[PDB]
Amino acid sequence: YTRVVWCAVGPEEQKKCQQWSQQSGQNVTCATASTTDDCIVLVLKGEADALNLDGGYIYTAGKCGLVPVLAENRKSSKHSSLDCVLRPTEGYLAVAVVKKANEGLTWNSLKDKKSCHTAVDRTAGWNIPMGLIVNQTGSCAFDEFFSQSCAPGADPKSRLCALCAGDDQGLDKCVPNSKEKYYGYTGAFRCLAEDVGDVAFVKNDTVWENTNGESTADWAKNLKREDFRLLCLDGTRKPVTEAQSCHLAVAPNHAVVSRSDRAAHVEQVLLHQQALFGKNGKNCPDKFCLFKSETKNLLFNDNTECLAKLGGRPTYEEYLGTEYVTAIANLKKCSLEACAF
Ligand SMILES: *[C@@H]1O[C@H](CO)[C@@H](O[C@@H]2O[C@H](CO)[C@@H](O[C@@H]3O[C@H](CO)[C@@H](O[C@@H]4O[C@H](CO)[C@@H](O[C@H]5O[C@H](CO)[C@@H](O[C@H]6O[C@H](CO)[C@@H](O)[C@H](O)[C@@H]6O)[C@H](O)[C@@H]5O)[C@H](O)[C@@H]4O)[C@H](O)[C@@H]3O)[C@H](O)[C@H]2NC(C)=O)[C@H](O)[C@H]1NC(C)=O
Numbered sequence: 001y002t003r004v005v006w007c008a009v010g011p012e013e014q015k016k017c018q019q020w021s022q023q024s025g026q027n028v029t030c031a032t033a034s035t036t037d038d039c040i041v042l043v044l045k046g047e048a049d050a051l052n053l054d055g056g057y058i059y060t061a062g063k064c065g066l067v068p069v070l071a072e073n074r075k076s077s078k079h080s081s082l083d084c085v086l087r088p089t090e091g092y093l094a095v096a097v098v099k100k101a102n103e104g105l106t107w108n109s110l111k112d113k114k115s116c117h118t119a120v121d122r123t124a125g126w127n128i129p130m131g132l133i134v135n136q137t138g139s140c141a142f143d144e145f146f147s148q149s150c151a152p153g154a155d156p157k158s159r160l161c162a163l164c165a166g167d168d169q170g171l172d173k174c175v176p177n178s179k180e181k182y183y184g185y186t187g188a189f190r191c192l193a194e195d196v197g198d199v200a201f202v203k204n205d206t207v208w209e210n211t212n213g214e215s216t217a218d219w220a221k222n223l224k225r226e227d228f229r230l231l232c233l234d235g236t237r238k239p240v241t242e243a244q245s246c247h248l249a250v251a252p253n254h255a256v257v258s259r260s261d262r263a264a265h266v267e268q269v270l271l272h273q274q275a276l277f278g279k280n281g282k283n284c285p286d287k288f289c290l291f292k293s294e295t296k297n298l299l300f301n302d303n304t305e306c307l308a309k310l311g312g313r314p315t316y317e318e319y320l321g322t323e324y325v326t327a328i329a330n331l332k333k334c335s336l337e338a339c340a341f
Pocket residue numbers: 075076077078080093204205206208209214242243244303
């Protein structure tokens with residue numbers, strides 16, 4: 001069967017995909033859509049084979065028959081004996097971040113402040129935190145908790161999009177793809193670094209990766225970790241070094257999905273593609289790297305050591321686990337077992 005069609009979300013991911021396609025000698029081809037959801041539709045239709053998804057979307061795709069294939073693994077300290085591809089995934093820490101200078105801002109006084117989310121329907125940027133705020137608040141009016149937000153994917157005319165900037169010309173305001181200045185882990189963090197928002201719902205990795213000269217991007221150049229605090233569920237505020245005892249939840253790694261009838265074929269190609277363009281791939285540093293895109297998290301997260309086999313041939317509910325799956329189901333009662341499309 002041997003040729004995989006990859007689905008890219010928006011213009012910037014399309015261009016990296018074209019490049020990956022070039023260096024692979026057409027072993028991988030690209031289809032493009034303006035949103036993650038449209039990419040999932042394309043995969044159902046059969047017009048694209050696979051894409052990498054945040055847990056939040058895996059839940060969506062899952063209800064539609066798509067299955068996780070391989071997962072992103074970042075370099076861990078424990079489980080050092082095992083090779084990255086066979087090594088179990090650790091998941092990541094959802095956290096809520098704020099400016100240290102913004103004193104007296106805690107989890108208990110988040111109401112009527114300004115929020116930065118990765119995008120609607122994502123784990124750390126939306127489901128985890130809006131899940132908690134609904135339960136704590138006993139109201140489904142999560143669109144009225146924060147005074148203004150940037151929540152890519154929500155109604156552009158709503159308060160949930162008020163803080164989103166769109167692209168260089170200010171078009172595509174709020175679109176849930178990287179054309180939005182404030183989309184995804186980085187976008188949401190920039191949203192805070194620039195004091196557009198009061199809080200940012202991202203992952204622990206995002207604060208480290210974009211502070212203390214890790215980014216060299218113009219807006220992160222001068223960001224110091226020491227100027228940021230984590231918000232914990234007990235009302236306290238801790239340094240970004242204490243993420244292990246001050247997070248909202250641990251989230252299942254982003255995974256590659258596909259139609260079940262296609263999983264095997266997607267898997268074999270992807271494993272070979274990474275032996276060539278992964279971290280120590282034949283042709284990475286020299287010609288092309290699947291896992292670099294200058295802090296921009298295009299196609300895969302920049303901190304991916306490798307894509308890993310799953311083991312236990314899990315179904316999407318097992319991959320995400322019971323915990324998270326009930327969090328999303330509960331939260332989706334505000335916004336009924338069927339494919340969204
Ligand atoms: C929040 O997010 C940030 C960013 O994602 C993250 O910080 C990053 O953490 C990773 C790993 O978790 C760091 O990676 C390390 O970086 C070093 C050099 O900078 C790399 O080079 C080496 O790798 C070696 C091989 O893995 C490693 O040796 C290993 O083996 C020794 C055995 O002798 C052992 O060390 C001893 O000490 C431990 C601890 O007390 C002891 O228990 C052991 O028995 C042992 O004797 C360890 O097993 C060790 O892993 C070298 O030590 C050396 O580190 C390497 O890749 C390494 O993984 C990144 O640098 C961090 N990123 C940035 C930008 O700073 C946080 O971890 C996240 N926090 C939370 C809470 O998750």
